[PDB]
Scaffold this active site. Structure first.
Site, short mmCIF file in Angstrom:
data_model
loop_
_atom_site.label_atom_id
_atom_site.label_comp_id
_atom_site.label_asym_id
_atom_site.label_seq_id
_atom_site.Cartn_x
_atom_site.Cartn_y
_atom_site.Cartn_z
N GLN B 10 114.31 -1.50 -7.55
CA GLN B 10 114.27 -0.31 -8.36
C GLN B 10 115.48 0.49 -8.03
OE1 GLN B 10 110.80 2.09 -7.74
NE2 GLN B 10 111.61 3.80 -8.94
N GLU B 70 110.43 -6.79 -11.05
CA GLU B 70 109.58 -6.37 -12.18
C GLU B 70 110.47 -5.96 -13.32
N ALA B 98 107.76 -7.99 -5.48
CA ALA B 98 107.40 -8.49 -4.17
C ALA B 98 106.27 -7.70 -3.54
CB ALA B 98 108.61 -8.44 -3.24
N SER B 139 117.77 -1.13 -1.59
CA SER B 139 117.00 -0.30 -0.68
C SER B 139 116.39 -1.17 0.41
CB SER B 139 115.87 0.42 -1.42
OG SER B 139 114.97 -0.52 -1.96
N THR B 144 111.85 -6.44 -2.93
CA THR B 144 112.93 -7.02 -3.71
C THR B 144 114.27 -6.59 -3.16
OG1 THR B 144 111.51 -7.06 -5.68
CG2 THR B 144 113.92 -7.26 -6.01
N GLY B 145 114.47 -5.28 -3.00
CA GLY B 145 115.63 -4.74 -2.32
C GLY B 145 116.00 -5.45 -1.03
N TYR B 223 113.61 11.54 -7.82
CA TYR B 223 114.55 10.44 -7.61
C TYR B 223 115.82 10.71 -8.39
CZ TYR B 223 111.67 7.12 -4.86
OH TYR B 223 110.96 6.49 -3.87
N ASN B 227 119.43 10.36 -6.96
CA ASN B 227 120.35 9.37 -7.53
C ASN B 227 121.62 10.00 -8.08
OD1 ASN B 227 118.27 7.57 -6.92
ND2 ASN B 227 117.67 7.24 -9.04
N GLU B 253 140.55 -3.06 1.54
CA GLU B 253 141.07 -1.87 2.21
C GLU B 253 139.94 -1.08 2.89
C1 LIG Z 1 96.43 7.07 -3.24
O1 LIG Z 1 97.39 6.61 -4.17
C2 LIG Z 1 97.32 5.18 -4.23
C3 LIG Z 1 98.09 4.40 -3.34
C4 LIG Z 1 98.03 3.01 -3.39
C5 LIG Z 1 98.87 2.11 -2.44
C6 LIG Z 1 99.15 2.78 -1.01
C7 LIG Z 1 98.20 2.86 -0.04
C8 LIG Z 1 98.56 3.47 1.20
C9 LIG Z 1 99.83 3.97 1.45
C10 LIG Z 1 100.86 3.92 0.49
C11 LIG Z 1 100.60 3.36 -0.71
C12 LIG Z 1 101.73 3.28 -1.83
N1 LIG Z 1 102.63 2.22 -1.42
C13 LIG Z 1 103.98 2.08 -1.97
C14 LIG Z 1 104.20 1.08 -2.94
C15 LIG Z 1 105.46 0.91 -3.49
C16 LIG Z 1 106.47 1.73 -3.09
N2 LIG Z 1 107.69 1.77 -3.44
N3 LIG Z 1 108.41 2.68 -2.86
C17 LIG Z 1 107.60 3.33 -2.02
C18 LIG Z 1 106.28 2.72 -2.14
C19 LIG Z 1 105.04 2.93 -1.56
C20 LIG Z 1 101.05 3.03 -3.07
C21 LIG Z 1 101.93 2.95 -4.34
O2 LIG Z 1 101.51 1.49 -4.93
C22 LIG Z 1 100.19 1.11 -4.26
O3 LIG Z 1 99.34 0.38 -4.71
C23 LIG Z 1 100.20 1.79 -2.95
O4 LIG Z 1 99.86 4.49 2.75
C24 LIG Z 1 98.68 4.04 3.41
O5 LIG Z 1 97.78 3.67 2.32
C25 LIG Z 1 97.18 2.43 -4.31
C26 LIG Z 1 96.42 3.18 -5.19
O6 LIG Z 1 95.58 2.58 -6.10
C27 LIG Z 1 94.25 2.61 -5.64
C28 LIG Z 1 96.47 4.56 -5.15
O7 LIG Z 1 95.69 5.33 -6.05
C29 LIG Z 1 94.56 5.96 -5.50
N1 LIG Z 2 117.11 7.27 -3.77
C1 LIG Z 2 116.33 6.49 -4.53
N2 LIG Z 2 115.44 5.86 -3.68
C2 LIG Z 2 114.57 4.99 -4.28
C3 LIG Z 2 114.60 4.82 -5.61
N3 LIG Z 2 113.65 3.93 -6.03
C4 LIG Z 2 113.05 3.58 -4.90
N4 LIG Z 2 113.55 4.24 -3.78
C5 LIG Z 2 113.16 4.00 -2.42
O1 LIG Z 2 112.77 2.65 -2.51
C6 LIG Z 2 111.94 2.35 -1.45
C7 LIG Z 2 111.01 1.28 -2.00
O2 LIG Z 2 111.84 0.27 -2.56
P1 LIG Z 2 111.99 -0.06 -4.13
O3 LIG Z 2 113.35 0.17 -4.79
O4 LIG Z 2 111.01 0.84 -4.79
O5 LIG Z 2 111.44 -1.55 -4.09
P2 LIG Z 2 111.90 -2.79 -5.00
O6 LIG Z 2 113.33 -3.18 -4.75
O7 LIG Z 2 111.64 -2.47 -6.46
O8 LIG Z 2 110.95 -4.05 -4.62
P3 LIG Z 2 109.34 -4.12 -4.91
O9 LIG Z 2 108.61 -3.77 -3.64
O10 LIG Z 2 108.83 -5.46 -5.37
O11 LIG Z 2 109.06 -3.14 -6.04
C8 LIG Z 2 111.34 3.67 -1.00
O12 LIG Z 2 111.68 3.86 0.35
C9 LIG Z 2 111.99 4.74 -1.83
O13 LIG Z 2 112.45 5.75 -0.96
C10 LIG Z 2 115.53 5.53 -6.33
O14 LIG Z 2 115.48 5.28 -7.58
N5 LIG Z 2 116.45 6.40 -5.86
MG LIG Z 3 109.98 -2.07 -7.22
#
Ligand SMILES: COc1cc([C@@H]2c3cc4c(cc3[C@@H](Nc3ccc5[nH]ncc5c3)[C@H]3COC(=O)[C@H]23)OCO4)cc(OC)c1OC
Ligand SMILES: Nc1nc2c(ncn2[C@@H]2O[C@H](COP(=O)(O)OP(=O)(O)OP(=O)(O)O)[C@@H](O)[C@H]2O)c(=O)[nH]1
Ligand SMILES: [Mg+2]
Ligand SMILES: Nc1ncnc2c1ncn2[C@@H]1O[C@H](COP(=O)(O)OP(=O)(O)CP(=O)(O)O)[C@@H](O)[C@H]1O
Ligand SMILES: Nc1nc2c(ncn2[C@@H]2O[C@H](COP(=O)(O)OP(=O)(O)O)[C@@H](O)[C@H]2O)c(=O)[nH]1
Ligand SMILES: [Ca+2]
Ligand SMILES: [Mg+2]
Ligand code: NA
Lengths: 419, 437, 54, 268
Positions: B10, B70, B98, B139, B144-145, B223, B227, B253
Site C-alpha cells: 500500500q 491486493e 499477505a 514499508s 507485501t512491503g 496518510y 504521504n 552519486e
Molecule cells: C477492532 O478493529 C478490528 C481490528 C481487526 C484486526 C486487528 C486486531 C488486533 C490488532 C490490530 C488489528 C489491525 N491489524 C492491521 C492490519 C493491517 C494493517 N496494515 N497496516 C497496519 C495494519 C494493522 C486490524 C486491521 O485489519 C484486521 O483485521 C486487524 O491489535 C491487536 O488486535 C479486525 C477487526 O475485524 C473484527 C476489527 O473490527 C472490530
Molecule cells: N506513510 C504511509 N504509511 C503507510 C501507508 N500505507 C500503509 N502505511 C504503513 O504501512 C504499514 C503496513 O503496511 P502496508 O503498506 O499497509 O502493507 P502492504 O504492503 O499492503 O502488505 P499487506 O499486509 O498484504 O497489505 C503500517 O505500519 C502503516 O504505518 C501510507 O500510505 N503512507
Molecule cells: Mg496492504
C-alpha cells in the site's frame, strides 16, 4: 473476499437471523433484498456478506435437524431475503446429543450442507473463509456444527474458520447434559476454528437482569445483545474504512498462539437519546459488565485487544481515551506483546445509537469460562450420569475423558501466559 | 539514463501516487500526460526523461510499476486523475494480500507473482536506453512491503546485477495504524535486503506524524498528509536525478557521497522549512535558518539524537532562492554553535547542491509554498537507535515465540528469525564501532 | 571553510565546503529456498488431511 | 494520575523521591520494564535513552542528562576543561609527557608506576583541619541551574560541617562570610561547567526531557580560593539534608513536568 455464513441449530439459527436483519438494515437492504440506502458506503463492501434484479441475497446457509426453527426464520421479517435453496434441514432432530449430531443423525445432512457451501464457495470470487453460529451446548449446532467445521476444513483448508459459539450456562439451561455437549464442542473448536467469539448465555442474562433491569429475560433479550455484538465485530468487515479488517489479518493480530483463539466480546452502550461521551463509551467498553463473556478481565491479562467506535465522534478524543485506559491499566496488558491494543473508528453508527464501541479481547481470563464447563463435566462424569445417552450412539467414555482433558490443558495454557 | 521506480505494498503505491503527482506538477506535465513545455514530442533526452517517457502522442509516462498483492489500492491509481499518466501494465494487482505476514508475501504469494512483476520491470528496462537503477518504495511492517519486496530485491540483484537501487522504506510507527507482528516483518525484510540495497532512506511515520501535527497544526494527520510531506522529501532527493545538476546526478552519486560502508547505507534525512498553508503570512526563513533547522531532531524523518553519533558524510540540498555564500555562512555559524563530529576516517565537509527552482506544494495542500528550503542527508551512527527499538520489540515477542506460527505455517522456519535478529545485532555493533568511541 | 567543486548550470549550482580535513545468490539458490517452503508447507497440509481422514 | 518506574534501587536520593511520589497520591510505581511510565529513575549505568520518548501519548522524563558523563567522570572533566575554550583558574591542573614538564612539586615516579595527575594542594585551608565542600546542584528540563542551600563540609602534616557553622568560623576566625569567601566562587564554577556542557546535553527539544542532581567537590586554600575536585553525576546527600533535597527535587523537576526555595537559581 466473500464470507460464507453458516448457522446451525435452534440458537445458531435464531441469533444468525437477527444478525442478518441488523446488518441488512445498516447496509440498507430490506426484506425483499432491494437496496434503498442513502450512502454508497453501504453498497461498497456489501459483497462481504451478500451476493447480487439488483437485489442482495445473504450468503448464508441455514442448517437444522428439525424444520421448526428454520420454518420460523422463513416466516420472519427477512425470511424472504434468505435464499430458499440455502435452507437445509432434516426431520430426525438431535435430541440434544452431540453424538446424535456429530455422529448418528448428522452424518446424513452434513453432505447436503457441504453441497450448498460448495456452491456458495464457487460463486465467491475470493473466499475469505466461513462464519458459523451455534450453541456449544445443544445437539445440532454443538455436535453437527463442529462436524461441518471439520468437513469444511478438509475441503477448504486455506480458508479462515470463525465461530460465534454460545457457551451454555446453568442460569439459562435446557438440559442437564449441556456441559457434556459443550466440552466436546470446545475441543472441536480448539482444533478446527481460527477465531471463536465466546458468547456466554450466562452473562447476557446477568447484563439483562442486573444492568438492563429485566427480571425475567427471555432468549430474545440475550439474542438482542448478541446481534449487537455481532454487528460490532463484523463492522470492520462490512463497512469500508481505514482498517478493512479481514478474517486472516484478524487472526494474525489477535492470536499469539493457536489454541488461544477464544475472545471476550464487549459492547457499550448496553441498551436512549443521550449519546455517550467518548470517555463514557471507552470506560464501558472495557467494563466487565459490558462484556458478553462472564469472565473478569482483571482476573487475567489481555494478550491482544481490538476496539471499534461507530458513529460520529472525535477521533483524537477516542485515541486519548484508549491511551489512558492502557496507561492506567498497564498491569492487565501482556508486556511481551508490544502494542497489544489497537482501535478503529467507523462513521456509520449502529442502528438506533448515535455512537457505540465494540471490544474484542484475547484475555487469559477467558479460562474462567472453560473452568466452569470443566467442573460441571467433572461433576456428572465422575458418576457417569446421563452417559448412556451418548454411549447409546456409539460413543465411549474415553472420548469424554479426552475432551475433558483437552479443555483443562487449554485452561492451563491461558494461565501460563497469564503468569 | 533512466530510473525505474517500483512501488510495492500500500504505502509504496500510495506514496508513489503522491511522488508522481508532485513530479507531474514540478515538470509541468498535464494529467493527460501532455507536457506543453516539452518540445521534443515523443523524443528528446532532457533531464525529466529519466523518470518519464515521451509517447508519439506527446504524453509522458512514469518509468515505474505500481504492484500490490491486493487490488483496491492500485485500482485507485487506475481510477485516479493520473490514471491516464500510468500505463495499465505498470499496474500489477493480485487477489489476496499477505495479511500482514512477511513469510506469506515472500514465499507463499511471492512466488506466484514474482515473475510477472519482473517481466513488467523488464519491459520498462528494454524501453530505457540506459537504466541507471531502480527506486523501490515500500514499508517494513506490511507483508507485501517486506516479504514480496525483499524477494524482488534478490531478483533485481540477479537480473539487473550492476544497476543500482535506492530504497525508501517506512519504519513502523505505533501511532499510525500498525499490525502487532510488524516488528518481525521489519527485521526479516531488513536482513534479506541488507545486501540488495545500495542506499536506504527510512521514514518513521512517528516522526512524520508529529511533524504534521506540529508545523501543519493537524490534529490527526491522515496518510494523505503524511504521504504529501514524504513526497516533498522524495522530490528533494529525486530532484538531482530529474533536473540538471552536478550533485547526485546519477544513482551512484548517492552511494558514493553518502554511503561509506555498505551495511551503513541508512542516511538520516532532515528537511526545512515545513510551513502550514492555513497561515496566510509566514516568516521567510533564511538560508542560515533552514540550514540550522536541519540539525534539529524535530525535523528529522527518523527521531534520534545526532549529538551522540559521529557523522560519515553530509549533504545539503537547497531548493529556492539560495546562494553559495549564504550556505557557507550558515554552515560556519552552525558549526561553531553545534555539536557536529565526523569520524576521523572522514573529512569534515558538506557537499551542497542548490536548485534555483523553488519548492513545489500541491494545490490545496496543508503545506504552504516557501521561497527556499533545504533537505539534509547525513549518515550518522545515531540512526542505529531506531534499529534498537525495533530489535527490542522483536525480542520481547520472540521470547514467547508469539505469532511465529503464522509465519512458520507459510513454510518459513523459526531459524530465520534468529538469523535476521543476529544480523540486526551485528549491524547495531557496526554502528557503535564507527561512531561510539 | 573552503568551497570547491563549484558547478553552475541553468537548473542550479553545487559546491563542496570542507571545514576540516580527515585525520550474489544464484537464481537457483533463491528458487531452491522458495521451493523448500512449498514442500514443508505441503507436508503440513498432508498431515492435516491425514488427521482429518483418521 | 502518574506512573514512574524505579530502575536504580541503589539510588538513595531517588529512592526517597519515589516514596514521596507514592505519598502524593498521584504517582504509582510500575514494573521496571513497564513502558508506560511518565518518569523513570533509570539505572546509573547503561540507561536506555534510544527507546525513551517514543511512546504515543506519554510524556517521559528521566533522572539523568544524556551526555553528562563528560563533566562527571574525572578523566572527561579534565579533557573538557582543557579542550573547551570557555572552560580556567579555579580548576587544579591535571594530567602525557607534559606531566614531566614536574621540572612546590607535589601531585596526587612511583605514582607513575602505580588516571589523572593533578597537583596536590600543599597549602590547604585548615580549621589544622581539612574539609571538603560538597554542593548539590539540580538541573531541570529547562537546564536552569539550582544549588541546594544546605551543604556539607567533609590533622594535617605538610609531610561533616554545616555551612552555617563553617560561616561562623569564617566570621570569627577570618572575619568573612562563607558566601563571600567561598560560596561565590562555587556558583561561578558550577555555572561554568554546566553551561559549557549545556548545548551537548540539552533536552529542550529532545523527545524525552531530562533532569539530574550533581555533587561538586570544592577545596579551599589558605587564600580562601575554591578549587573544583570532581563532579558527581549520582551524588548522595547528607542524612539530615536528604528530606529537604529529595522533596525539592520532586517539586522542582518531577512536579514542573508532571504537575500534581531550598535551592539557589544560578540559571533561569
Ligand atoms: C477492532 O478493529 C478490528 C481490528 C481487526 C484486526 C486487528 C486486531 C488486533 C490488532 C490490530 C488489528 C489491525 N491489524 C492491521 C492490519 C493491517 C494493517 N496494515 N497496516 C497496519 C495494519 C494493522 C486490524 C486491521 O485489519 C484486521 O483485521 C486487524 O491489535 C491487536 O488486535 C479486525 C477487526 O475485524 C473484527 C476489527 O473490527 C472490530
Ligand atoms: N506513510 C504511509 N504509511 C503507510 C501507508 N500505507 C500503509 N502505511 C504503513 O504501512 C504499514 C503496513 O503496511 P502496508 O503498506 O499497509 O502493507 P502492504 O504492503 O499492503 O502488505 P499487506 O499486509 O498484504 O497489505 C503500517 O505500519 C502503516 O504505518 C501510507 O500510505 N503512507
Ligand atoms: Mg496492504
Ligand atoms: N589536587 C588535590 N589537592 C588536595 N587534595 C585533593 C586533590 N585531589 C583530591 N584531593 C582530596 O582527596 C579526595 C579525593 O578526591 P575525589 O573527590 O576524586 O575522591 P573520590 O575518588 O572518592 C570521588 P568523590 O570524592 O566525589 O566520591 C577528595 O576528597 C579531595 O579532598
Ligand atoms: N443466546 C441464546 N441462547 C440460546 C438460544 N436458543 C438456545 N440457546 C441455548 O442453546 C442451548 C441449547 O441448544 P439448542 O438451541 O436447543 O441447540 P440445537 O440442538 O441444535 O437446537 C441452551 O443452553 C440454550 O441456552 C437463543 O435463541 N439465544
Ligand atoms: Ca520529451
Ligand atoms: Mg433446543
Ligand atoms: Na435416520
Amino acid at each position: 473476499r466473500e464470507i460464507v455464513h453458516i448457522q446451525a441449530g435452534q440458537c445458531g439459527n435464531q441469533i444468525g437471523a437477527k444478525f442478518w436483519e441488523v446488518i441488512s438494515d445498516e447496509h440498507g437492504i430490506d426484506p425483499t433484498g432491494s437496496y434503498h440506502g442513502d450512502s454508497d458506503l453501504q453498497l461498497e463492501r456489501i459483497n462481504v456478506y451478500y451476493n447480487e434484479g439488483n437485489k442482495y441475497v445473504p450468503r448464508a446457509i441455514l442448517v437444522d435437524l428439525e424444520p421448526g426453527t428454520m420454518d420460523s426464520v422463513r416466516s420472519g421479517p427477512f425470511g424472504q431475503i434468505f435464499r430458499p435453496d440455502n435452507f437445509v434441514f432434516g426431520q430426525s432432530g438431535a435430541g440434544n446429543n452431540w453424538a446424535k449430531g456429530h455422529y448418528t443423525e448428522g452424518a446424513e445432512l452434513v453432505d447436503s450442507v457441504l453441497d450448498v457451501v460448495r456452491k456458495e464457495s464457487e460463486s465467491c470470487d475470493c473466499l475469505q473463509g466461513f462464519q458459523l453460529t451455534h450453541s456449544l451446548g445443544g445437539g445440532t449446532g454443538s455436535g453437527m456444527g463442529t462436524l461441518l467445521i471439520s468437513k469444511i476444513r478438509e475441503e477448504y483448508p486455506d480458508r479462515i474458520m470463525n465461530t460465534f459459539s454460545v457457551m451454555p450456562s446453568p442460569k439459562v439451561s435446557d438440559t442437564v447434559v449441556e456441559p457434556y455437549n459443550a466440552t466436546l464442542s470446545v475441543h472441536q473448536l480448539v482444533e478446527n476454528t481460527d477465531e471463536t467469539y465466546c458468547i456466554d448465555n450466562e452473562a447476557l442474562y446477568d447484563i439483562c437482569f442486573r444492568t438492563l433491569k429485566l427480571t425475567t429475560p427471555t432468549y430474545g433479550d440475550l439474542n438482542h445483545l448478541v446481534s449487537a455484538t455481532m454487528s460490532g465485530v463484523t463492522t470492520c468487515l462490512r463497512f469500508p474504512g481505514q482498517l478493512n479488517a479481514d478474517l486472516r489479518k484478524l487472526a494474525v493480530n489477535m492470536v499469539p498462539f493457536p489454541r488461544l483463539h477464544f475472545f471476550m466480546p464487549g459492547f457499550a452502550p448496553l441498551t436512549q437519546y443521550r449519546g455517550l461521551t467518548v470517555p463514557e463509551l471507552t470506560q464501558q467498553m472495557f467494563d466487565s459488565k459490558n462484556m458478553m463473556a462472564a469472565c473478569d478481565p482483571r482476573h487475567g491479562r489481555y494478550l491482544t485487544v481490538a476496539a471499534i467506535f461507530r458513529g460520529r465522534m472525535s477521533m483524537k478524543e477516542v485515541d486519548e481515551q484508549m491511551l489512558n485506559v492502557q496507561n492506567k491499566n498497564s498491569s492487565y496488558f501482556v508486556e511481551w506483546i508490544p502494542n497489544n491494543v489497537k482501535t478503529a473508528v467507523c462513521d456509520i453508527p449502529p442502528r438506533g445509537l448515535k455512537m457505540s464501541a465494540t471490544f474484542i479481547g484475547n484475555s487469559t481470563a477467558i479460562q474462567e469460562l472453560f473452568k466452569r464447563i470443566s467442573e460441571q463435566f467433572t461433576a456428572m462424569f465422575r458418576r457417569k450420569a446421563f452417559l448412556h445417552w451418548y454411549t447409546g450412539e456409539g460413543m465411549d467414555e474415553m472420548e469424554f475423558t479426552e475432551a475433558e482433558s483437552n479443555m483443562n490443558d487449554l485452561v492451563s495454557e491461558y494461565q501460563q501466559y497469564q503468569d | 539514463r533512466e530510473c525505474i521506480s517500483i512501488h510495492v505494498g500500500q504505502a509504496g503505491v500510495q506514496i508513489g501516487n503522491a511522488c508522481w503527482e508532485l513530479y507531474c506538477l514540478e515538470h509541468g506535465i498535464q494529467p493527460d500526460g501532455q507536457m506543453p513545455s516539452d518540445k521534443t514530442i515523443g523524443g528528446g533526452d532532457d533531464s525529466f526523461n529519466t523518470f518519464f517517457s515521451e509517447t508519439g502522442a506527446g504524453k509522458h509516462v512514469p518509468r515505474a510499476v505500481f504492484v500490490d498483492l491486493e487490488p483496491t489500492v492500485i485500482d485507485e491509481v487506475r481510477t485516479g486523475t493520473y490514471r491516464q499518466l500510468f500505463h495499465p501494465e505498470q499496474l500489477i494487482t493480485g487477489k489476496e494480500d499477505a495479511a500482514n505476514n512477511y513469510a506469506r508475501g515472500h514465499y507463499t504469494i511471492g512466488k506466484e507473482i514474482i515473475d510477472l512483476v519482473l517481466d513488467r520491470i523488464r519491459k520498462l528496462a528494454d524501453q530505457c536506453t540506459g537504466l541507471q537503477g531502480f527506486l523501490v518504495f515500500h514499508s517494513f511492517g506490511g507483508g507485501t512491503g517486506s516479504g514480496f519486496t525483499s524477494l524482488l530485491m534478490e531478483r533485481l540483484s540477479v537480473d539487473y546485477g550492476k544497476k543500482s537501487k535506492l530504497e525508501f522504506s517506512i519504519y513502523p510507527a505505533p501511532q499510525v495504524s500498525t499490525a502487532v507482528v510488524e516488528p518481525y516483518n521489519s527485521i526479516l525484510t531488513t536482513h534479506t535486503t541488507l545486501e540488495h540495497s545500495d542506499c536506504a532512506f527510512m521514514v518513521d511515520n512517528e516522526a512524520i506524524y508529529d511533524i504534521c501535527r506540529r508545523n501543519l497544526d493537524i490534529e490527526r494527520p491522515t496518510y494523505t498528509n503524511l504521504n504529501r510531506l514524504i513526497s516533498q522529501i522524495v522530490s528533494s532527493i529525486t530532484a538531482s536525478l530529474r533536473f540538471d545538476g552536478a550533485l547526485n546526478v546519477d544513482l551512484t552519486e548517492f552511494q558514493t557521497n553518502l554511503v561509506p560502508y555498505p551495511r551503513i547505507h541508512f542516511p538520516l534525512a532532515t528537511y526545512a522549512p515545513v510551513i502550514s498553508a492555513e497561515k496566510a503570512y509566514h516568516e521567510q526563513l533564511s538560508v542560515a535558518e533552514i540550514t540550522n533547522a536541519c540539525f534539529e531532531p524535530a525535523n528529522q524523518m527518523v527521531k534520534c539524537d545526532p549529538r551522540h553519533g559521529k557523522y560519515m558524510a553530509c549533504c545539503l540540498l537547497y531548493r529556492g532562492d539560495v546562494v553559495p555564500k549564504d550556505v557557507n555562512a550558515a554552515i560556519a555559524t552552525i558549526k561553531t554553535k553545534r555539536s557536529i563530529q565526523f569520524v576521523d576516517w572522514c573529512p569534515t565537509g558538506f557537499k551542497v547542491g542548490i536548485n534555483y527552482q523553488p519548492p513545489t506544494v500541491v494545490p490545496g495542500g496543508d503545506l504552504a509554498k516557501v521561497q527556499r528550503a533545504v533537505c539534509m542527508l547525513s549518515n550518522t551512527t545515531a540512526i542505529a537507535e531506531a534499529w534498537a527499538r525495533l530489535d527490542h520489540k522483536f525480542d520481547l515477542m520472540y521470547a514467547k515465540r508469539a505469532f511465529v506460527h503464522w509465519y512458520v505455517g507459510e513454510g518459513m522456519e523459526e531459524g530465520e528469525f534468529s538469523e535476521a535478529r543476529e544480523d540486526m545485532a551485528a549491524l547495531e555493533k557496526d554502528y557503535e564501532e564507527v561512531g561510539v568511541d | 571553510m573552503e568551497v570547491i567543486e563549484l558547478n553552475k548550470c541553468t537548473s542550479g549550482q553545487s559546491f563542496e565546503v570542507i571545514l576540516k580535513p580527515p585525520s550474489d545468490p544464484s537464481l537457483e539458490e533463491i528458487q531452491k529456498k522458495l521451493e523448500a517452503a512449498e514442500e514443508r508447507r505441503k507436508y503440513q497440509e498432508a498431515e492435516l488431511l491425514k488427521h482429518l481422514a483418521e | 494520575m502518574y506512573t514512574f518506574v524505579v530502575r536504580d534501587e541503589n539510588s538513595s536520593v531517588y529512592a526517597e523521591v519515589s516514596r514521596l511520589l507514592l505519598a502524593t497520591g498521584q504517582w504509582k510505581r510500575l514494573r521496571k520494564d513497564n513502558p508506560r511510565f511518565n518518569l523513570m529513575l533509570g539505572e546509573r549505568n547503561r540507561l536506555p535513552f534510544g527507546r525513551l520518548g517514543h511512546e504515543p501519548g506519554l510524556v517521559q522524563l528521566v533522572n539523568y542528562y544524556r551526555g553528562a558523563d563528560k563533566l562527571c567522570r574525572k578523566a572527561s572533566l579534565v579533557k573538557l576543561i582543557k579542550t573547551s575554550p570557555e572552560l580556567c583558574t579555579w580548576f587544579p591542573e591535571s594530567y602525557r609527557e607534559v606531566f614531566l614538564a614536574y621540572n612546590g612539586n607535589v601531585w596526587i615516579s612511583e605514582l607513575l608506576d602505580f588516571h589523572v595527575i593533578q597537583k596536590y594542594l600543599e597549602k590547604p585551608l585548615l580549621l589544622h583541619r581539612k574539609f571538603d565542600i560538597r554542593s548539590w546542584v539540580l538541573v531541570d528540563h529547562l537546564y536552569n541551574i539550582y544549588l541546594y542551600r544546605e551543604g556539607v563540609l567533609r590533622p594535617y602534616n605538610s609531610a561533616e560541617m554545616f555551612f552555617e557553622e563553617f560561616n561562623q568560623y569564617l566570621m570569627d576566625a577570618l572575619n568573612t562570610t562563607l558566601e563571600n569567601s567561598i560560596l561565590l566562587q562555587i556558583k561561578h564554577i558550577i555555572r561554568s561547567c554546566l553551561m559549557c556542557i549545556e548545548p551537548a546535553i540539552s533536552t529542550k527539544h529532545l523527545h524525552y526531557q531530562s533532569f539530574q542532581l550533581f555533587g561538586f567537590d570544592f577545596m579551599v586554600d589558605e587564600e580562601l580560593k575554591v578549587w573544583l575536585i570532581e563532579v558527581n553525576g549520582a551524588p548522595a546527600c547528607a542524612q539530615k539534608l536528604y528530606a529537604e533535597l529529595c522533596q525539592g527535587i520532586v517539586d522542582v523537576a518531577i512536579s514542573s513536568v508532571f504537575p500534581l526555595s531550598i535551592f539557589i537559581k544560578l540559571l533561569e
